[PDB]
Design a protein around this ligand. Structure first.
Ligand SMILES: [Mg+2]
Ligand SMILES: [Mg+2]
Ligand code: NA
Lengths: 192, 192
């Protein structure tokens, strides 16, 4: 059996697109960061660098009620996770971190899964700020480094390509998924 | 470092006492199950056995807004988890399962931890319906058996005594903690 931990923001749910659209809607006069100029995992810090007052503004978008509930799916993501879940000798968990400002994030993530993937996938959510203490064979995640209390996680991190990580070049000893069309089944097969 | 997974309901937060209190307040005419007569992990099924329509009435208590937020702490629990978190070479996570009816459970659990233990402990929450895929040395949990996709969890389950499990007689292979005034430090030491 192969256990796949599938990240939520940037892999199933399009956080970055949601952030930019909410920022453009609520702060139309201010400078913004086009998606393909994004660099680094923390959008708030790139906005701060653009202009100091933008840090709190962009935070207000992703901390607002409804923000997580209303995110659009990543193309191909929901079909892929459905397909993956239905493979023999495969199990899937959705392994996601809440924001530090958790209040409108935790419940909305559960509802987003319920609505987009259904009740069977709600039961496969793991909410944690430390993914390294979750046992699995693979972690598909857009964060460029996934760190925590286990120095040597059980899983292999598969970087899922996203605007903020596109610029990185992995060494030949590592693998990137370019998108959900980039033959994920072969990565799972390497663990069988 | 020894990593201790600490359950929430029945170990930190007194679910059973809150359930009974809420049931007696909402349904003051109805028969109830005194805590000392509780048997089996799921109160709802004991109520169903008492009279079939009581099952849904008890569920309406623990599904109501505020139910989780308003639980009282288990005696000694908050002090013990504070002391444990500060021990040298010791890691604590709060590892808790949401209800299937998650809506008024997930956010309320985060707020309960924030209020009773503080923001830093909120970062130590792991929400999962499968605790067997969480890495640790020890799981302190009142559920009589803790099962999931790993047939042999990394952790040793320490059964935390609660009204519903007290009469359970276990083989000497399974260890029990009678309360937070029992010798939990020795159990941690047995893994160092
Ligand atoms: Mg992500
Ligand atoms: Mg419990
Ligand atoms: Na399957």
């Amino acid at each position: 059996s192969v256990r796949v931990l599938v990240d939520m923001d940037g892999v199933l749910a399009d956080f970055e697109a949601g952030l930019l659209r909410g920022f453009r809607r609520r702060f139309p006069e201010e400078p913004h960061v086009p998606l393909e100029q994004r660099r680094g995992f923390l959008a708030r810090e790139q906005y701060r660098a653009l202009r100091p007052d933008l840090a709190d503004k962009v935070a207000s978008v992703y901390e607002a009620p409804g923000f997580f509930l209303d995110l659009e799916p990543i193309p191909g993501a929901l079909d892929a996770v459905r397909e993956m879940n239905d493979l023999p000798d495969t199990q899937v968990f959705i392994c996601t971190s809440p924001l530090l400002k958790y209040h409108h994030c935790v419940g909305e993530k559960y509802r987003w899964v319920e609505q987009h993937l259904g009740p069977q996938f709600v039961e496969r959510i793991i909410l944690t700020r430390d993914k390294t203490v979750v046992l699995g064979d693979l972690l598909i995640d857009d964060k460029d480094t996934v760190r925590g209390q286990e120095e040597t996680p059980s899983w292999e991190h598969i970087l899922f390509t996203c605007c903020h990580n596109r610029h990185l070049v992995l060494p030949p000893t590592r693998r990137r998924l370019l998108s959900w069309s980039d033959n994920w089944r072969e990565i799972l097969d390497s663990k069988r």
